Enzyme design. Structure first.
Site, mmCIF file in Angstrom:
data_model
loop_
_atom_site.group_PDB
_atom_site.id
_atom_site.type_symbol
_atom_site.label_atom_id
_atom_site.label_comp_id
_atom_site.label_asym_id
_atom_site.label_seq_id
_atom_site.Cartn_x
_atom_site.Cartn_y
_atom_site.Cartn_z
ATOM 1 N N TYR A 170 13.431 -17.438 -46.036
ATOM 2 C CA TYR A 170 13.418 -18.458 -44.993
ATOM 3 C C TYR A 170 14.850 -18.676 -44.510
ATOM 4 O O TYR A 170 15.758 -18.774 -45.337
ATOM 5 C CB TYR A 170 12.884 -19.795 -45.552
ATOM 6 N N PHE A 220 11.419 -21.954 -38.119
ATOM 7 C CA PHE A 220 11.966 -20.998 -39.093
ATOM 8 C C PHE A 220 11.911 -19.532 -38.646
ATOM 9 O O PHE A 220 11.000 -19.123 -37.925
ATOM 10 C CB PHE A 220 11.242 -21.170 -40.443
ATOM 11 N N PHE A 232 17.869 -26.729 -41.524
ATOM 12 C CA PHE A 232 17.035 -27.186 -42.648
ATOM 13 C C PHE A 232 17.620 -26.747 -44.007
ATOM 14 O O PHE A 232 18.417 -27.459 -44.618
ATOM 15 C CB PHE A 232 15.555 -26.770 -42.464
ATOM 16 N N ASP A 233 17.200 -25.576 -44.485
ATOM 17 C CA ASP A 233 17.545 -24.956 -45.765
ATOM 18 C C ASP A 233 17.165 -23.462 -45.696
ATOM 19 O O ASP A 233 16.330 -23.066 -44.873
ATOM 20 C CB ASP A 233 16.781 -25.665 -46.905
ATOM 21 N N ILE A 253 7.445 -28.257 -47.917
ATOM 22 C CA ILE A 253 6.917 -28.450 -46.555
ATOM 23 C C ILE A 253 5.482 -27.895 -46.519
ATOM 24 O O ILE A 253 5.272 -26.742 -46.902
ATOM 25 C CB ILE A 253 7.830 -27.734 -45.523
ATOM 26 N N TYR A 279 6.538 -33.681 -42.925
ATOM 27 C CA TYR A 279 6.774 -34.820 -43.821
ATOM 28 C C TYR A 279 6.050 -36.103 -43.372
ATOM 29 O O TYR A 279 6.167 -37.139 -44.032
ATOM 30 C CB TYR A 279 8.293 -35.081 -43.881
#
Ligand SMILES: Nc1ncnc2c1ncn2[C@@H]1O[C@H](COP(=O)(O)OP(=O)(O)NP(=O)(O)O)[C@@H](O)[C@H]1O
Ligand SMILES: Nc1ncnc2c1ncn2[C@@H]1O[C@H](COP(=O)(O)OP(=O)(O)NP(=O)(O)O)[C@@H](O)[C@H]1O
Lengths: 409, 628, 110, 628
Positions: free
Chosen positions: A45, A118, A55-56, A75, A101
């Protein structure tokens, strides 16, 4: 802008068909399977957000993020995005607010009711091993309801569709008492896998040979003793085999007094896995206990020890000598001076050829009871095994450095 | 002769204060908060002998108001304010400072100590402002507005607007490219960073709800500088609520040192051991150190490698001082020789912290499990404190039941015939505890220290002695055991009866070993590779061959000379003696001796020069074992 | 009328005090075993300064000195014992607001 | 509304320029040399359009004259000098710059540049000077002396001393403890550090010969700033002489770039690749990089970690620019954005330098044999440049012998059925070349890249692909060799035949391996230990287990999932199949399967979990083999 593009494009991969999670596939992966509930799954990701922030990423560490479907990771759109990708599949992924969320937000920079986006690649997945020993693999189509499961002693209602080496042979609903299944047209692997199943759970089970229809087989379907099988299960409803918080030990001890006798009748009947399931259900039922009085705990540990002493014999008759010794290891945890528990451990180790450990417990049988003739005979057999093994090795290896010096030409 | 005063070119002098002093624009907010903290301290002081000075208002506080639609940041206080004279002086005159002029008038018994002294800090508002308006109201004069674009002039007018009673309201009309200082996130960051220990509540007026018409964040400094209080009065709960406020950690501190230095420097500090090592503690080359330096509770700098040595970088802490020399920017300290005198005291008091922590064994284990790397790195880098740091070391030993003991506990147990502390090193506790080299030590009943991290091999190069006992590796040549004369004679006889075999084996193994010798260190292993004393051990060589950025040219001469030791009583070796005395050149002796050498390299913790040529020996023994 | 602003530091033998009175006039200094007294008129306005400094440790008047410049007055005080460290200028722990350490020339000489 | 001009308090403003601007006193000699280099440029410029301006003196020079007797440092200057009105203006007015005023009075086409712009630099003399005298004569005025202690006033008078001809003579009367700035070692340091590249001869006149009445140290700046010339004007011997002058190396540079950046941020640079890697290159953690930044030929800073990334730390170089924004001390830049845009261009042209150097094979070998660590460290850190840095890599391979080849050469030799670049990693070229993992690669005539330094094991984490070909480690599971459908069928027939043996061996080796599998990478070895796809390799685990300052719990989470691969054609394995089928519990199979595993850990580059438990098996086989 792939993360901006997935906002309005891709395959709808949501369980609801709600357009809440979309994938734009740039490289379709290998295999027609995509991950199932309870799978371990590994995905690259990189991620961006509706506020224009990061995000991450697992791509940035060069190691995938790891997921467990139906429990999830972080998520709900990542759980859906995982569950619907093939191996080596590359795509762009959407996450609408209800799949992000909701109102809660997230760290470092995700606002309340954010949309997340993403760039992603699915690497690999593994099924749930129900034991971590290759015995049963289970992969889940639908998660069920409940904190307590129908282990042995339960009455259950199930949809059961059964395959022999892949060949389908039965497709029907069955009701049964768990831990008896050859008498109900059910393999040992269903009697064990149901210890982990919830209400209206739907799953595929791969059953190893020790999880077939035991010593009985099913000749009606052409199926051998200890066959290897594949199954579809829905657990529809159950009378649960009460846990240690749900019921006392005394109820499980009165059931153990009946079940130890049934195990003995199955053992003397040559049905050693049906006997393992009787002693082994007493082992499930009593070792789970807590909050007992000292007298209740002595009774609990006594019916554990008697079940481990007969599990030892059943696993010796099965030639599963590792499982015989794993039972004797616990008979000697319940009482480190039990005579049959010291002896049976010696047998399991000596039949496994580890004579130095076997004499090491037969010599304790002769502390508990010096008159135990079998422990004296089996100590002599430990030394016969040691002497024969070392003489065998001497017959093989002697003069090898001369032989090698002669062979070198 | 003619005599002249100096002048200043105000148009250029103002341009310097704007363009050249301050390297980060964000400091303007710390300067205007420091000016308000001075203005509050002046009125808080003057009210101590006259309560009526607060008739015009009693809540001493600061408020920040970012008005986005007017592109304006307001900073307001209920401080002393300025008279018309004090405006035209102290804001009209560069390098004039009312704060300094106030403190020069005080007696020594005054409790006050203010931030300002350079007479420049207000002008830093023009880093971000197009124009600044200062509304102000002292007690002894009217309300006035001062305003300027810094364009060589300013205007002062009597202000007919909103009555303030007593205080100041600095209005910054921001530049179009400086609107980020209107974002409440940015304002929180800058205030929390530079100024969270200002002694007065800094309130940030945020935004409409979704309804509250304009929500105010009550205090950006929702904390206290507890280090200013007496260390005897502060309880460990108060230190813990502060440690969390300081660091944003959710966990408590492990131990805390709170102290003051009194002298040419005067300073106070809090030094905290955190409950856990940061996951990046040595990896994060950007966050080098975790001490913050404050002067009069305003932040100066943090990431200064001069404040404490790298081995203490795990300590979270605060230093605060009354009278240090600040650079014109206030972004750094001036006289770098002060960082040395801070560093000497911070280090001295940390080793007192660990020395008092080492009396509380149960917490000392929670410390050492995580910061042993830091103590051992201290033994490596810090030659002055190496004595004290050695008493902080804990190690497993052969006479310790899977528990860690100090070198002083080892000295308590030593047999009186010892003059050395015997240690071993290797990759795991089981690898060293089973290892061939300790066999004789275990027979004589002698304690062996196990050192099993890669950092231990750096530590023992520096740690040559403890309490006058030589720290001696069991993996190096000629191990001095406390033998008796009967055994010493047996070793001379055994060296005599094997010297023929030692020559024969040295011929077979040549250049793969420096020599072959009879062993006073084995019982049940037939042989082991030790090294010459002057070079890298078997463990050090494997570590240095894995340091990715190290030059190979030192490895070519620091790699020590391998010595094979022979056990004189092993049945393989007595048989190999009977073989070697029959024929020096026997093909079975040649292949057996090189097999014992390869088995000894593996057992001693070297790698083989080629493992495949060794595996091809075991696969030939296995072909016989299977009967091929 | 008011103490002059002063910067101070030491060395193994001497304690140094610089009184920051630019274009100073009528400068007078008195050295005594346990005390320094300083007075002058300020160059901008003829404001009369007076500093009395009851010293942290003894000094020698026979080797102590002062000098006046168009920028400042420097006093050099000979320590009564060389190698005495001075943690403060005065016998008292008084926080004299006009006095601070001169970190342009302070060094940890000890 | 009442309007006021701003003012300044001169007595405080002067004290800021002395106390708070400059943190290090040594810059006072940079400032007085710079004001002289500006005065020399001013008179040189006036001489171009009217030569008669030099009739009062034709030499343009700076003389430092220390005088240990008078305690004075003099700085003589044969530049333009100052009229009485220019002393009173430019030395008398703080922040007035006569240099800036002159520079702005010129036509924009003027071929000139000057160091001064802030109008405060002269006052830095009072860092070290107790008093300053400036003696000067202009062509249009008499000789005057200006003099002050920085006392808020200064005196000007007609001097009538010995005649200057035309220029300036600054005399610094040094303070009672500032006399180190008279030491010729001190002056040589400060001038070679700060002002070595000033465009005029800086001579030093010291003490006497002991014979001339003074040592005429005829230059402090014998070198010239060669970077100001055009890259077409300069031969490699001139760059070589400059590189020795810059660094005190005795070798020439290996390769050089000479830039000419144009735009907003206009700069020139010389970047030199050394002839050899510095002995301390990565070990000197204080020296972040070897680049010096200059503005108008005056030194600004060195060792700034923002100028180039630490993988380029070996580049010794100069950056020079006309236009960068300086901090008030002149020891740093105001904006970090200027360092970003410098660094982008420095890195972008370094990778062009190595790209032009890589065409010249013999010079590329001299580079890569020393700086290969820097390219490989570059591919780990520098995410933008991996696409270019990977064309700089050179390695040994199974078809190049002892030569080094690039990934472009590997992709030239690849068989058309390869989609992958096969590579292997280990401690030595002979360990990897004679390893078990390569056997069928070597049989199929497929080339394997050998990767040997511990830094290569970081590089290949990031270097996933080259020219669309995936780099695959031959030590990892699932090795997709190009092989025929007949071979794919035989492999599945062999997996079918050996499925019992694989299950039985996993039960003997339980928790020591995740799998036992039949495989295609082997030919002549019976088995090897292969890691999973997403774990550490055997080499990576050895490297990570040796990093002394890394948290082993936190990094150890991805320690290797070991698989045992089985060669189905090996006579050991075919026999072992028959024995394991005949009795699963056979003590011979239980001993030989664990001995095959412990041998396979060694041939596959792991360490054993305990070498002593292994060595005892070998000593038992040696006892049996000798009949003991
Ligand atoms: N909010 C305020 N309330 C009262 N007086 C103020 C305020 N802001 C500024 N002043 C006055 O303005 C003077 C000059 O301010 P400023 O330019 O900020 O420098 P400084 O704070 O005095 N010293 P520094 O911060 O070290 O530069 C102060 O000393 C006060 O006399
Ligand atoms: N040796 C000299 N010869 C001629 N003019 C000089 C000399 N030294 C100083 N000046 C003059 O004095 C002015 C002010 O000097 P100075 O205070 O040093 O600042 P600056 O050099 O002008 N700018 P900066 O170096 O950036 O601080 C110069 O600009 C010149 O006009």
């Amino acid at each position: 802008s792939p993360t901006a593009t997935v906002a309005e494009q891709g395959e709808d991969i949501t369980s609801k068909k709600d357009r809440g999670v979309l994938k734009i596939v740039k490289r379709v992966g290998n295999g027609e399977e995509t991950p199932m509930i309870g799978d371990k799954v590994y995905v690259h990701y990189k991620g961006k957000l509706s506020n224009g922030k990061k995000f991450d990423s697992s791509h940035d560490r060069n190691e995938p993020f790891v997921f467990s479907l139906g429990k999830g990771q972080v998520i709900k759109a990542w759980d859906i995005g995982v569950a619907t990708m093939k191996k080596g599949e590359i795509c762009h992924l959407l996450c609408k607010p209800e799949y992000a969320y909701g109102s809660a937000g997230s760290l470092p920079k995700i606002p309340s009711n954010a949309t997340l986006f993403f760039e992603i690649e699915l690497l690999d997945f593994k099924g749930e091993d129900l034991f971590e020993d290759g015995g049963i693999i289970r992969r889940t189509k639908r998660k069920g309801e409940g904190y307590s499961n129908p282990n042995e002693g339960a009455t259950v209602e199930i949809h059961l569709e059964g395959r022999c080496g892949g060949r389908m042979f039965d497709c029907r609903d069955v009701a049964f008492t768990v831990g008896e299944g050859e008498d109900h047209d059910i393999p040992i692997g269903i009697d064990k896998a149901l210890e982990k199943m919830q209400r209206e759970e739907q799953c595929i089970l791969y059953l190893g040979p020790r999880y077939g229809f035991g010593e009985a087989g099913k000749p009606k379907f052409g199926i051998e003793p200890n066959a290897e099988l594949i199954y579809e299960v829905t657990l529809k409803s159950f009378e649960k085999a009460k846990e240690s918080w749900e019921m006392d030990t005394k109820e499980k001890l009165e059931q153990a007094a009946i079940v130890k006798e049934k195990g003995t009748v199955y053992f003397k009947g040559g049905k050693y896995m049906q006997a393992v399931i009787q002693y082994g259900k007493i082992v499930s039922w009593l070792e789970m206990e807590y909050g007992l009085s000292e007298k209740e705990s002595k009774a609990s540990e006594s019916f554990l020890l008697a079940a481990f002493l007969n599990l030892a014999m059943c696993y010796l008759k099965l030639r599963e000598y590792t499982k015989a010794v794993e039972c004797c290891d616990k008979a000697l945890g319940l009482d480190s001076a039990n005579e049959k528990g010291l002896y049976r451990r010696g047998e399991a180790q000596l039949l496994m050829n580890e004579f130095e450990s076997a004499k090491g417990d037969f010599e304790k049988v002769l502390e508990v009871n010096p008159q135990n003739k079998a422990a004296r005979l089996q100590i002599s057999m430990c030394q016969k095994k040691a002497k024969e093994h070392n003489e065998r090795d001497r017959r093989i290896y002697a003069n090898m450095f001369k032989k090698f010096a002669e062979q070198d030409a | 002769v003619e005599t002249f005063a100096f002048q200043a070119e105000i148009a250029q002098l103002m341009s310097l204060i704007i363009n050249t002093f301050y390297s980060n624009k964000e400091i303007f907010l710390r300067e205007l908060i420091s000016n308000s903290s001075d203005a509050l301290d002046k009125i808080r002081y003057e009210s101590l002998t006259d309560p009526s000075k607060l008739d015009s208002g009693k809540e001493l506080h600061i408020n920040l108001i970012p008005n986005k639609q007017d592109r304006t940041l307001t900073i307001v206080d209920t401080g002393i304010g300025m008279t018309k004279a004090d405006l035209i002086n102290n804001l009209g005159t560069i390098a004039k400072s009312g704060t300094k002029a106030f403190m020069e008038a005080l007696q020594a018994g005054a409790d006050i100590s203010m931030i300002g002294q350079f007479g420049v800090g207000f002008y830093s508002a023009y880093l971000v402002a197009e124009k600044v308006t200062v509304i102000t109201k002292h007690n002894d004069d009217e309300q006035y507005a001062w305003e300027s674009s810094a364009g060589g002039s300013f205007t002062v007018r009597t202000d007919t607007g909103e009555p303030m009673g007593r205080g100041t309201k600095v209005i910054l009309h921001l530049k179009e490219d400086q609107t980020e200082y209107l974002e409440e996130r940015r304002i929180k960051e800058i205030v929390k960073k530079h100024s969270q220990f200002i002694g007065y509540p800094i309130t940030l007026f945020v935004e409409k709800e979704r309804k509250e018409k304009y929500i105010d964040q009550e205090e950006l400094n929702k904390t206290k500088p507890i280090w200013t209080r007496n260390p005897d009065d502060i309880t460990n709960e108060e230190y813990g609520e502060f440690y969390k406020s300081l660091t944003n950690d959710w966990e408590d501190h492990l131990a805390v040192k709170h102290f003051s230095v009194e002298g040419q420097l005067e300073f106070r500090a809090l030094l905290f051991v955190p409950r856990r090592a940061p996951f990046d503690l040595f990896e994060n080359r950007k966050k080098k150190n975790n001490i913050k330096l404050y002067v009069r509770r305003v932040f100066i700098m943090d990431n200064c490698e001069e404040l404490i040595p790298e081995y203490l970088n795990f300590i979270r802490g605060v230093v605060d001082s009354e009278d240090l020399p600040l650079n014109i920017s206030r972004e750094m300290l001036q006289q770098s020789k002060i960082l040395k005198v801070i560093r000497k005291n911070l280090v001295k008091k940390c080793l007192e912290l660990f020395t008092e922590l080492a009396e509380d064994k149960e917490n000392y284990k929670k410390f050492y499990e995580q910061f042993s790397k830091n103590i051992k790195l201290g033994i490596h880098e810090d030659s002055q404190n190496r004595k004290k740091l050695s008493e902080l070391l804990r190690y497993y030993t052969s006479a310790s039941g899977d528990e860690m003991v100090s070198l002083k506990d080892y000295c308590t147990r030593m047999k009186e015939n010892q003059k050395h502390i015997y240690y071993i090193t290797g990759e795991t506790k089981d690898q060293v505890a089973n290892s061939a080299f300790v066999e004789r030590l275990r027979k004589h009943g002698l304690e062996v220290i196990y050192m099993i991290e890669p950092i231990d091999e750096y530590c023992v190069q520096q740690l040559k002695e403890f309490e006058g006992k030589t720290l001696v590796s069991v993996t190096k040549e000629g191990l001095e055991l406390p033998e008796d004369e009967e055994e010493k004679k047996k070793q001379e006889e055994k060296k005599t009866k094997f010297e023929n075999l030692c020559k024969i084996m040295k011929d077979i193994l040549e250049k793969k070993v420096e020599k072959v010798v009879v062993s006073n260190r084995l019982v049940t292993s037939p042989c082991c590779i030790v090294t010459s004393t002057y070079g890298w051990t078997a463990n050090m060589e494997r570590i240095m061959k894995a340091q990715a950025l190290r030059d190979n040219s030192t490895m070519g001469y620091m790699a020590a000379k391998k010595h094979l030791e022979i056990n004189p009583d092993h049945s393989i070796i007595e048989t190999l003696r009977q073989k070697a005395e029959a024929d020096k050149n026997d093909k079975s002796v040649k292949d057996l001796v090189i097999l014992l050498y390869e088995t000894a390299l593996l057992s001693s913790g070297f790698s083989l020069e080629d493992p495949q040529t060794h595996a091809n020996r075991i696969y030939r023994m296995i072909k016989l074992g299977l009967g091929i | 009328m008011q103490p002059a602003s002063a910067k101070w530091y030491d060395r193994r033998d001497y304690v140094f005090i610089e009184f920051c009175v630019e274009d100073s006039k009528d400068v007078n200094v008195n050295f005594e075993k346990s005390k320094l007294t300083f007075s002058c008129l300020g160059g901008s306005d003829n404001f009369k300064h007076l500093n009395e400094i009851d010293l942290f440790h003894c000094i020698d008047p026979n080797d102590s000195k002062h000098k006046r410049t168009d920028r400042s007055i420097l006093c050099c005080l000979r320590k009564g014992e060389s190698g005495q460290s001075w943690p403060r200028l005065t016998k008292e722990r008084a926080k004299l607001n006009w006095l601070s350490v001169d970190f342009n020339n302070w060094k940890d000489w000890e």
